Design a protein around this nucleic acid. Structure first.
Ligand SMILES: [Ca+2]
Ligand SMILES: [Ca+2]
Ligand SMILES: [Ca+2]
Ligand SMILES: [Ca+2]
Ligand SMILES: [Zn+2]
Ligand SMILES: [Zn+2]
Lengths: 542, 351, 542, 351
DNA sequence: GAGTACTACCACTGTGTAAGACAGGCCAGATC
DNA sequence: GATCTGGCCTGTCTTACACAGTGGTAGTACTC
DNA sequence: GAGTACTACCACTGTGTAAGACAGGCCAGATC
DNA sequence: GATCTGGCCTGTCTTACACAGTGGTAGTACTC
């Protein structure tokens, strides 16, 4: 006999229907039975402890314009959209958990690990039930091709760390910290929609409640029966799982090959060729709000362009607080597509032939891809993905490319370039840089300095007035970000985008299939898929 | 009374079911659009050029003293007519932002200068409101009235969100009708007054309101509490007495069961109603001439053009008046792949 | 502990990848272990008793131009296509077993049931090892939409019955007969291709060996070690799982709305409106061969049309023996689409208005579908499928349609029509009519007589010179077919088309995915999917 | 030499890589279609009409005394030229059936009568063979020779299936070269003789054989035993002495490494070779003029037309001569969805 | 000691897009 | 009739999007 | 006696095609 | 210049092609 939880997890984690699992259950039950698996209806009853809407909690003070019911499950995302025909239509199909309920679910699921974190720090448990601090990574991304694409947006969050500040004289004793923050298996879905990223009208209509509730939770303290005792939690949100496109869309910036390039600085694009490394972090959500009011009222009666430059590119009203940070994965893909282009433009020579054709660009791409296929055994890709970018930023792929550029200063140059890049990639790819690559963390300014200056010198034919955004961020902003927050790569969107992969599997084998239900099903199955408690049943001491 | 299908050549992603058409100095301006203003057009207001069955859009600019201006979605829209001091404006209040807020500010939008090369600059003065201000709302209506011979501006109807105390994150997109008060906005100064009417028992929204020379006729709205569509017609008569604007009202016997109409003006005080929707499933397909005098309103069916199969089998539709008895209408389009031209367009014309 | 066979079947029958099954095996093995499931490699080793190429057999006399190796498994179907570029290309991707090997596999799989049939008829077993007769139903169909369609053809067979004639003074003691011959789970795939039905050039190039082997096996006797003893089998093949398009294509007839309508008779289309019920079976494979000889040599020097008529529509050389019969399922679909049309032309008036428009036909279709939706709660279908056709030929759908035809003579007419049809449908839909519905088999001639004559009378406006093929077959040929071959419906291709549904499943989840391998994989899993021995492990006394 | 892309307006599906073009009396006839003969055309032979950059196909009919005729796929094709008794035929033997059997019969295909209205009728006489008949084969070749002054027909080369005793159902589509004999077919009577040649050590297939006035020049074939494309040109010289047609042969120094070519005739005994394939991966892209006299064959590169990118990046290609220095070429086409026009067509022309 | 099981190796689809900012080119066209 | 200029165009640059997840093979942990 | 399990109920995509034979309409076009 | 006729066209008819297979609900076998 197995515990019903274990078999629930067996059914979620191996992608089985009800009817397939049942066929197997009756089969293994009539040969050698003795019942091994549980029947279906006792897993439907077993899970209701794991979905959102089961534990009782309460906030103090009460939540502002949030209801006091604590047992709500899966709602439809329209949030009471009155469906008259004269208003803008209610075409959207969306489903969601009510944010705080799913929070309290994910905490009651990490109740084992907060308790053993308490016991392991040799901290007492009847005391210190008042001052817990959870740090929550939220994350949102659109997603195409779910056979028109009928694209999907999938807003999720992940519990990053939970530390303790009670009772006083200190600042915080970390109790838990996420060992694998970029995994799917720690990226919990909160809300799904059949929406395009781009139409800000539907995204804000569905996500308006969610941000209202987040804004409502930053003041109150949560109260949970955790370990027998009622205890008090407070929350800090770090919005970091946004690719850059979306950060600009939702911070009122203009997208994305603009004159205003940095999300963190005020420097123009050409001004960030001259000075590649000297920029302080200035932008904040509340200053975007103040500058947008500069834009609306125009209190000094300036023209379109004097206004745009007075406000450094805030022409839209910010609608979502976002942590001013970077995304490790998309930084990788940008730098890989940049280096791929640089190699393509170095096989053919374009520091001699300063303006080349399109068809010689195609010749050079084909010869680069053939060369990278003969040694290094790579195929060509439609679009840069993570594995290709990882394999592409190696010493020996550069070394197999350098065999085609003839001048051995271009060669030794870009070998110096690549090895500089490898000397500084681990500071922004690390899950924690200060512990796992500390000398690179302190050598970062010097390393990036020489990288910038070598681009200035031996590539000025390319970077006279135009730089890619990630290159800007990676060269001017990394030391200051990682000193303020502690880590990079830990906060990436990877886990979210990786979760889209899962989302695809569920859409096929577990569809209703109907729009009114397909999200309620993907959503339930995805939420089970992530609860730690069923993942320990998954590992079972490995 | 002919409709001919147009085709919008380039730029069709910049139009959404609720938008506004402003006729300024013979030139027609599209206002409100999907999204925040792109940087192709950092102002968000477009000039409409109809030629050879084509719809072309041109980026308008502002002045230096002008305030910039979010793309309201179903705002209330008042043709301020040419008089003293500066003709000839266009009051906008308040509509719904592109980020779904509701607007609590009044904008006066005028023409400012020309040319050089058929270039026009507009301007926006954000008019500050002191009252008794009206609450942020949308789908309501604004009209201008003249009495002896001061000029004021009457505002009535509309939907809003539920009050901020009862508004819940499962109510967040729910709407309720705002209380049925009328607002007198004088436009200099920015003084607003609210007046309650024994006869105006419940709020309504998406109605047309037509004013002439201090009498306003409110035609058929949509009431959302009872989801009824009253066919009655309201006529209210103001007079701006020193210095309290007395205000009387009557229920007239029969008006018209429409919602969300297109009122093109053809004559001096004569319009044509191009039809939004009669019932929740069945859009009003016949045209109606509405002349109005000092006896009251008069009203006759004209025979509608032969609606194409395409504009007949659509589920929804919207559009607006290019003025002078001509209007633009739009139909959602269905194809696979997406066209991605989302809407087919027609041009309608009277006589 | 479970037997490795049982768990192999658990993994095939519930649609699980190796890595999904492994995740569950490891999971249920570290909670509560004691190993319940077998590991993967012992299932890989467990099945080679069940795939083709395992048991030793031999033929006497040896097989004509068939190799003597008995241990061959999965071949690629090109069969040694020399891949010169100047010849027709070897573009086809195809896989197949080798016909006789899969035959001997299917018999060694039915070892248990032949032996139990021997013991249950109280027949001795060391005697009677020489006179066995197996009747094999083979079956071929094309198949679209496997995401151009990249259509697929899937040539399969099914063991129908096995009887005994040894030793003499008798004709045959049936020992097994298939209780459920139209199921998938008794339809064993033999060969797969990415081919269109229509291009006769690739189909004959891949299927040429197969027909050569079939033609080679009708003379010899097989020799198999079954129940400890070497025993001798003979084979009779009945090619019946072909829809009509395919039978015409494969018998040299012209397709399919020709002037020669019947596959079994010589009557012209117009001549099969005057005489609806009086036709004898004449056509045979060998007569097609000698009429094609008439066509090619033209020994009497007549014109195109006089020759076509001399030869009754044999203008192509027949390439595959096919049993001259009908397909019960496709007969159903033809008669249902016919009655759907007749209703459509009775709601609108046609015997009054002898020529209507297409847009009146469209009005009538819409009103018919609305009526059938109000009562009978059916939705409208793009195409007729089996469930719709079954539900459509009910008394109460006619009864809900008759409420729209006004004259209660047309009404009572077509009620008499439908009930006649229901009085004679079970004779051709039955798995065995002579035992299960014998009086309808006796009353069939009379019932069809009155059906024909009521069409002659009350529908002359429709059937003046034009009749559908199935209506012809069902009205002129059913008594003689079911007298000669014992049953109908038992030989349909429905079970084959039903296995196309399974084909789809495997392509989605058990793919390589590559063309060189995808067929080797679909083919292995489909063959396992059907072997009886794993289905008894599936039911295990229910 | 110019190439101009055609487009085949209708009936795209009735053409397959190995097919034949017979030039009869100025009119060109396509022969050997995919499939058995549909009833659009129960004869299986089509008339080719080129106009306006369009390819049009017209159904030809037969006579009453004619035998009908399966669609051979790569048959051997002999222009019997106008002499006694009945001009001017076209010998076909034997190619490959639409149901992939190999043809063991010989068909004489002549013109018979016209009109009325540009109607032509052909006829087929199935000619019976008595020998020493040749085995069913394909890709071989047939030519006509005149010696003092009788006319005979020489047949040599080709592929076949493995002998019926070693043909296995895993060898079924495997081919081997048939023994390198030559066959003298006299055309009345149907007397065939087989002759073995010390110089002809191995069979070959898909070669071009050109004959003139009792000498035949075999140009580059493909040999499948050794997977080489020999460039050695063969020249054999017959003479019909009653009763034994004595037959000599020589290997000439250098010919041409081609396979599966297009030999259009332009002159009296002068052809142009449009090219099949040089190596297994690399199709022969240059044209070659081949004049032949009684000294021997002479041979010169002309410069080829500028092959479009489309006919340059195809993997395979085929086609045939519309005669008189004009030919038709075909390219497989790739698109999604399928066009379903499977082949793009070009018309090539000399001078 | 080997023989088991596990887990990591490989082959592989398909080899383009989709919107948008901005530079620059330049031209309708309308006034001067 | 000359300008020129505001606006259309074209190309180019930049930011995302698809491509996992499945069989078989085999080294390798690893252990009866 | 109920309470378990099993098995059958319902919702539901999407609401057209793809080839071909043949009748008939008819017209290029070429001869008479 | 008249025919008419063989050939193109158009529509119509007939033969196949997708739509299972998955959650949830609940009657119901059926039994601790
Ligand atoms: Ca992404
Ligand atoms: Ca089928
Ligand atoms: Ca993105
Ligand atoms: Ca079929
Ligand atoms: Zn910066
Ligand atoms: Zn018949």
């Amino acid at each position: 006999g197995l515990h019903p939880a274990v078999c629930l997890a067996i059914r979620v984690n191996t992608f089985l229907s009800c009817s397939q699992y049942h066929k197997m259950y009756r089969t293994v039950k009539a040969t050698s039975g003795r019942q091994i698996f549980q029947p279906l209806h006792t897993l439907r009853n077993a899970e209701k402890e794991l979905l959102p809407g089961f534990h009782q909690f309460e906030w103090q003070p009460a939540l502002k314009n949030v209801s006091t019911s604590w047992d709500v499950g899966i709602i439809d995302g329209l949030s009471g959209w009155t469906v008259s025909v004269d208003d803008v239509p209610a075409d959207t199909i969306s489903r969601r958990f009510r944010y705080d309920v799913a929070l309290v679910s994910a905490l009651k699921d990490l109740e084992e690990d907060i308790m053993e974190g308490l016991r392991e720090r040799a901290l007492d448990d009847s005391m210190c039930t008042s001052g817990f601090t959870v740090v929550v990574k939220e994350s949102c991304d659109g997603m195409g091709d779910v056979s028109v694409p009928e694209k999907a947006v999938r807003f999720s969050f992940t519990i990053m760390s939970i530390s303790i500040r009670l009772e006083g004289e200190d600042d915080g004793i970390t109790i838990f910290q996420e060992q694998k923050p970029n995994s799917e298996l720690s990226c919990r879905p909160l809300c799904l929609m059949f929406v395009d990223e781009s139409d800000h009208e539907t995204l804000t209509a569905i996500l308006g409640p969610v941000v209202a509730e987040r804004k409502a939770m930053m003041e109150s303290r949560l109260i949970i029966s955790v370990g027998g005792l009622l205890r008090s939690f407070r929350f800090f949100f770090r919005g970091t799982g946004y690719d850059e496109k979306m950060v600009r869309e939702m911070e009122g910036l203009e997208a994305s090959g603009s004159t205003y390039i940095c999300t963190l600085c005020d420097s123009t694009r050409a001004e960030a060729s001259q000075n590649m490394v000297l920029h302080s972090i200035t932008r904040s959500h509340d200053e975007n709000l103040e500058r947008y009011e500069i834009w609306r009222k125009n209190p000094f009666s300036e023209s379109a362009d004097e206004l745009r430059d007075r406000v450094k590119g805030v022409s839209a009203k910010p609608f979502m607080e976002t942590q001013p940070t970077l995304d490790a994965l998309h930084c990788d893909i940008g730098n890989a597509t940049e280096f791929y282009k640089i190699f393509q433009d170095e096989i053919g020579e374009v520091y001699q032939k300063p303006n080349p054709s399109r068809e010689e660009r195609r010749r050079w791409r084909s010869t680069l891809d053939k060369q990278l296929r003969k040694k290094m055994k790579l195929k060509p890709v439609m679009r840069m993905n993570g594995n290709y970018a990882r394999r592409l930023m190696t010493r020996e792929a550069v070394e197999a490319v350098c065999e085609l550029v003839p001048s051995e200063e271009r060669r030794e140059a870009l070998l110096k370039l690549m090895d500089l890049y490898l000397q500084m990639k681990p500071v922004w790819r690390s899950t924690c840089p200060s512990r796992d690559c500390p000398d690179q963390l302190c050598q970062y300014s010097y390393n990036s300095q020489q990288f910038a200056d070598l681009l200035s010198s031996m590539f000025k034919y390319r970077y006279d007035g135009k730089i890619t955004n990630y290159l800007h961020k990676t060269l001017a902003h990394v030391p200051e970000i990682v000193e303020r927050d502690g880590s990079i790569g830990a906060w990436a969107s990877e886990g979210n985008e990786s979760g889209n992969k899962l989302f695809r599997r569920f859409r096929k084998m577990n569809a209703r299939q109907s729009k009114t239900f397909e999200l309620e099903d993907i959503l339930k199955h995805h939420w089970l898929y992530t609860s730690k408690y069923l993942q320990k049943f998954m590992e079972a001491h490995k | 009374m002919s409709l001919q299908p147009l085709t919008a050549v380039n730029c069709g992603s910049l139009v959404q079911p609720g938008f506004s058409l402003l006729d300024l100095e013979g030139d027609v301006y599209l206002f409100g659009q999907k999204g925040w203003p792109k940087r192709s057009c950092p102002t968000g207001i477009f000039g409409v050029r109809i030629k050879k069955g084509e719809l072309k859009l041109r980026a308008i600019s502002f002045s230096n003293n002008s305030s910039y201006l979010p793309p309201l979605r179903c705002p209330a829209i008042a043709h301020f007519e040419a008089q003293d001091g500066k003709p000839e404006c266009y009051l906008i209040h308040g509509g719904r932002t592109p980020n779904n807020e509701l607007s609590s500010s009044l904008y006066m939008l005028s023409v400012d200068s020309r040319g050089c090369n058929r270039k026009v600059t507009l301007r926006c003065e954000e008019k500050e409101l002191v009252g008794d201000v009206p609450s942020a709302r949308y789908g309501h209506t604004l009209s201008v009235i003249n009495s002896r011979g001061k000029t004021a501006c009457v505002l009535f109807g509309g939907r809003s969100y539920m009050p901020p105390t009862e508004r819940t994150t499962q109510n967040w997109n729910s709407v309720v009708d705002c209380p049925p008060q009328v607002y007198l906005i004088d436009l200099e100064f920015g003084c607003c007054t609210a007046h309650t009417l024994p006869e105006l028992t419940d709020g309504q929204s998406f109605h047309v309101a037509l004013a002439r020379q201090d009498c306003v006729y409110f035609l058929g709205g949509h009431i959302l509490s009872s989801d009824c569509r009253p066919s009655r017609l309201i006529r209210l008569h103001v007079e701006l007495l020193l210095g309290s604007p007395v205000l009387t009202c009557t229920i007239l016997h029969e008006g018209l069961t429409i919602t969300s109409a297109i009122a093109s003006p053809i004559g001096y005080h004569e319009y044509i109603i191009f039809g939004g929707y009669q019932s929740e499933t069945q859009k009003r397909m016949e045209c109606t001439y509405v002349g109005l005098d000092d006896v009251g309103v008069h009203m006759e069916s004209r025979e509608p053009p032969q609606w194409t199969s395409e504009i007949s089998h659509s589920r929804t539709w919207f559009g607006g008046s290019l003025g002078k008895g001509t209007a633009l209408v739009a139909i959602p389009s269905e194809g696979n792949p997406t066209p991605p031209e989302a809407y087919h367009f027609y041009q309608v014309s009277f006589q």
